[PDB]
Design a protein around this nucleic acid. Structure first.
Ligand code: 0R7
Ligand code: CA
Ligand code: MG
Ligand code: MG
Ligand code: MG
Length: 539
DNA sequence: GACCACGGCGCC
DNA sequence: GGGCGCCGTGGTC
């Protein structure tokens, strides 16, 4: 390409190099742009950023987040990564996409700009004719990238002092558990080392080994195994409590306060748009989609996520989302009728499980039923189910027979989906997002059946994901107009931040936008909560 | 230091 | 059953 002075003309593709992957923390090392056979290199990247009207190129959202951090309103535009991910969601990295669609991902900004330009041309070509994928790109993925940039740059407030204090408390409890374990083992060892623990449990205390690990065939010390052995020796429950506390301390309590940004005073995650096989987003550095909520200590951590003073959090959650999506995709009259009547399958299964009418099913019972309903729907074996519910095998095989007896068109949909997957090589969501599943015709049963369960799950999980992304795209401009902010997405949950005086109005509006995002054969229902912290806002 | 595989486990 | 990302260990370079 011909070397030309900065700045580039409008519509140019950008290339950039960062000192590290996280754009909120990165130094912008180099910046360049490519258009019309020319490459333009920025003499000073930060100042040069002000010359761009949009970020158009590979990883555009990352550059946009960095620009927002610097107080510039530079939105992301076209990004070849999003095109490639739509063609085939195994396209997740710039390295892989480059090699596959016509270049090499290097560490030089000018080369990255030229690459962005060539790849976009190539991928745009592959998408011609693909009307549904083009719709997803134009109506969902491309504008969602702008919404995600704002969310990343905004971050979320965390009560640092509270977490520091909590760390000290938890450390003391860990010491008490550790001391007791060692006493019961008759010697100290590294309780964090599963290899060392395996030897104490199975070789020294002589407990029965229940299971083996996948890759290396060691005797497993997983929670499922320890639960099975909690009556066999008092050390086992102490180990389970130790695991719970150290997992929470090492993963959340200790790292989180160190990730507060000096400029914002907030915690900033990355929302990865081309990371999953199904079209869900992921969250990383730190992952904020797996913040604890189950246990008492988990709930105390969830309370550390708070609104700015004078604001409130608003938490929105689609109810029974995958079952509702399944009803639409399958067209099963019975399942459809369940939701038109206002019924709850989780509650109804929890009635069966715990032996309760339908009334007085506490929230905890309902949640236990979730794993059962999802597990069974997606192909959990009758043996795992019998083991989970502590019931005879024949009662489990019967339970699954009844599950699919109640909604006969679900099986037919599953069969239909698997056949198209075998014939075409991919399966699709309601909106045409695809996932290629080559192992559907594998001659090894375990491999083939694993592929089947991935294949028929994808349209359900991915349709739910598409619906939430669409909702986020629709909701974002409405929030801006009300001075509210979108903070986090957790798959089928959204967390917003609103001025206290407008939080009620924000919640009502957000609920309506999410419920009416794309009408299905059954109503979408959204539960909404308001509070000073994440836990309080989820009621 | 960084990277890796693994087992294990947090949430959806 | 499906989908993720991060931890510490043990190991390497
Ligand atoms: C305690 C506890 C506890 C906490 C979490 C779970 C859990 C869980 C799982 C979730 N998923 C997928 C499908 C539905 C979507 C949104 O997960 P979720 O909101 O919980 O499902 P829902 O919308 O039907 O439940 P509702 O909002 O009405 O209370 O995420 C899944 O495939 N497998 C799971 N095990 C089970 C128990
Ligand atoms: Ca939900
Ligand atoms: Mg939820
Ligand atoms: Mg792994
Ligand atoms: Mg080490």
């Amino acid at each position: 390409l011909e070397e030309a002075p900065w700045p580039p003309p409008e519509g140019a593709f950008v290339g950039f190099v960062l000192s590290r992957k996280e754009p909120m923390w990165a130094d912008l090392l180099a910046l360049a742009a490519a258009r019309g056979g020319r490459v333009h290199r920025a003499p000073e990247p930060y100042k040069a950023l002000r010359d761009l009207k949009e970020a158009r190129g590979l990883l555009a959202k990352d550059l946009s987040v960095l620009a927002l951090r610097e107080g510039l309103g530079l939105p992301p535009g076209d990004d070849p990564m999003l095109l490639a991910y739509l063609l085939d969601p195994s396209n997740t990295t710039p390295e892989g996409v480059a090699r596959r669609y016509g270049g090499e991902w290097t560490e030089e900004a000018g080369e990255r700009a030229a690459l962005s330009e060539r790849l976009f041309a190539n991928l745009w070509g592959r998408l011609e004719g693909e009307e549904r994928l083009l719709w997803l790109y134009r109506e969902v993925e491309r504008p969602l990238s702008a919404v995600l940039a704002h969310m990343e740059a905004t971050g979320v407030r965390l009560d640092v002092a509270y977490l520091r204090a909590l760390s000290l408390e938890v450390a003391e409890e860990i010491a008490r558990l550790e001391a007791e374990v060692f006493r019961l083992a008759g010697h100290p060892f590294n309780l964090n080392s599963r290899d060392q623990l395996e030897r104490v449990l199975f070789d020294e205390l002589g407990l029965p080994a229940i299971g083996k690990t996948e890759k290396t065939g060691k005797r497993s010390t997983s929670a499922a195994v320890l639960e099975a052995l909690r009556e066999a020796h008092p050390i086992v429950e102490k180990i389970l409590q130790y695991r719970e506390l150290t997992k929470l301390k090492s993963t959340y309590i200790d790292p989180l306060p160190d990730l507060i940004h000096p400029r914002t005073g907030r915690l900033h995650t990355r929302f990865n748009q081309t990371a999953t096989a199904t079209g869900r987003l992921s969250s990383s550095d730190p992952n904020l989609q797996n913040i604890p909520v189950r246990t008492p200590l988990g709930q105390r951590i969830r309370r550390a996520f708070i609104a700015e003073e004078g604001w409130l959090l608003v938490a929105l959650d689609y109810s029974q989302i995958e079952l509702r999506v399944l009803a639409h995709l399958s067209g099963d009259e019975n399942l459809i009728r369940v939701f038109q009547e206002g019924r709850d399958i989780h509650t109804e299964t929890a009635s069966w499980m715990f032996g309760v009418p339908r009334e007085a099913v506490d929230p905890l019972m309902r949640r236990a039923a979730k794993t059962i309903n999802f597990g069974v729907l997606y192909g959990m074996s009758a043996h795992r189910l019998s083991q989970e519910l502590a019931i005879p095998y024949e009662e489990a095989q019967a339970f699954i027979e009844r599950y699919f007896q109640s909604f006969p068109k679900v099986r037919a949909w599953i069969e239909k989906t698997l056949e198209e997957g075998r014939r075409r090589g991919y399966v699709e969501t309601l909106f045409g997002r695809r996932r290629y599943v080559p192992d559907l015709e594998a001659r090894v049963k375990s491999v083939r059946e694993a592929a089947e369960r991935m294949a028929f799950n994808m349209p359900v999980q991915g349709t739910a994901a598409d619906l939430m992304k669409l909702a986020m795209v629709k909701l974002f401009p409405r929030l801006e107009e009300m001075g509210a902010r979108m903070l986090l997405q957790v798959h089928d949950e959204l967390v917003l931040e609103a001025p206290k005086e407008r939080a009620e109005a924000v919640a009502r509006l957000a609920k309506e936008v999410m419920e009416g995002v794309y009408p299905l054969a059954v109503p979408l229902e959204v539960e909404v909560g308001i509070g000073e912290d994440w836990l309080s806002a989820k009621e």
